[PDB]
Amino acid sequence: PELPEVETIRRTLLPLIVGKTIEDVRIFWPNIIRHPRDSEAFAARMIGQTVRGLERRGKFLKFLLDRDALISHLRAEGRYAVASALEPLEPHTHVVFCFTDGSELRYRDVRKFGTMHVYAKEEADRRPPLAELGPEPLSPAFSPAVLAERAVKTKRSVKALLLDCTVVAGFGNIYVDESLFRAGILPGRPAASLSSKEIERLHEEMVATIGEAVMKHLYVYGRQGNPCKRCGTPIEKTVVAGRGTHYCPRCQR
DNA sequence: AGGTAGACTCGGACG
DNA sequence: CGTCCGAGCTAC
Ligand SMILES: [Zn+2]
């Protein structure tokens, strides 16, 4: 899931778990657990804590308990569900939080690619994976000025810059390509090559693109070989910043 | 110094 | 049957 979907998960999951108390934590793929390094310590420490809140930073979910925060990243295919301990688990369920009311918060991930870290709440923001995370794209903290300052100081492409979690939080591949198309900027452009006008336009399209998605369709992403919706030129796909990258070679320069 | 590329994690889809 | 893919500690 991308940022807007993670926000939807945050909003919908919270009422399904708030106020529940963890009675057991079962782990079927210990590698998902990144901190504490020992999955048995991870399980032991959460037992007895009650869920108090659920926040989002970038694409990270931050479960707030009594003493600890659980920081979870789902990557592309991770998913949470709340269900009865009496019913068989869905396939690819790797971690289950069992509540005293007989319900469970289950984490599934066919790719086994997501991560979990638990720290005392007051430490979470200054430890991985939240440490050094950039500002929320929809916050005043993410400004043209902030974007301009990062862009001038790097030799990287503008696409690489936008994918950098320290620059802006959780702005995914799809939204990078869409925003660059909407701003009329080629993804392979050196970030430092962007004018003030272009940085302003890019910031504006980033906010509009992800903001529109958060409230509730694609110009380029996955549309290679099909006509641009604005000019009819075939959309092209190449590798930029180590990712599949889609663009219109007429609309973007 | 620290910015930056590479290694790493996985299994479904693809040739 | 190998190769590809991609979000977010190690080593030049
Ligand atoms: Zn076009």
Residues near A35 by beta carbon (within 8 Å), at least 6 away in sequence: A42, A117, A118, A119, A127, A128
In this complex, the residue with its CA at the shortest distance from the C1' of nucleotide C6 is: A243
Q: Technique behind this structure?
A: X-ray
Residue A35 annotated as binding? no
- H-run or E-run covering A4: helix A3-17
Ranges for all domains in chain A classified under CATH 3.20.190.10: 1-132
Residue with tokens 């430092």: A192
Residue A31 (CA) to nucleotide B7 (C1'), in angstroms, measures 17
Does residue A3 contact residue A171 with C-beta atoms inside 8 Å? yes
Ligand 1: distance of its center to the CA of A220 in Å?
A: 9
Architecture field, domain A1-132? Alpha-Beta Barrel (3.20)
How far is the C-alpha of A179 from the C-alpha of A162, rounded, in Å? Answer: 10
Residue A111 annotated as binding? yes
The residue type found at A67 is R
Does residue A21 contact residue A102 with C-beta atoms inside 8 Å? no
The CATH label, of 3.40.50.360, 1.20.210.10, 1.10.8.50, 1.10.287.4070, for the domain at A133-253 is 1.10.8.50
Does A1 participate in catalysis according to the annotation? Answer: yes
Strand C: positions under 7 A of a protein C-beta atom = 5-9
- Supply the DSSP string of A199-248, one letter for each residue: HHHHHHHHHHHHHHHHH---SSTT-TTSBPTTT-PBPEEEEETTEEEEE-
Residue with tokens 């990078």: A176
- Cβ of A155 near strand B (under 7 Å)? The reply is yes
Residue A111 (CA) to nucleotide C4 (C1'), in angstroms, measures 15
Q: How many CA atoms lie within 13 A of A238 on its CB side?
A: 10
Ranges for all domains in chain A classified under CATH 1.10.8.50: 133-253
How far is the C-alpha of A163 from the C-alpha of A167, rounded, in Å? Answer: 8
Closest to A57 in 3D by CA, of A146, A133, A115, A108: A133
How far is the C-alpha of A167 from the C-alpha of A206, rounded, in Å? Answer: 13
Residue with tokens 């931050």: A62
Give burial (CB, 10 Å; 0-12/13-18/19+) of A21.
Answer: middle
CB atoms within 10 A of CB A134: 19
Largest CA distance in chain A: 60
**Eight-class DSSP state of A51:** P
Those residues whose beta carbon sits under 5 angstroms from the ion ligand 1 are A 228, 230-231, 233, 248, 250-251
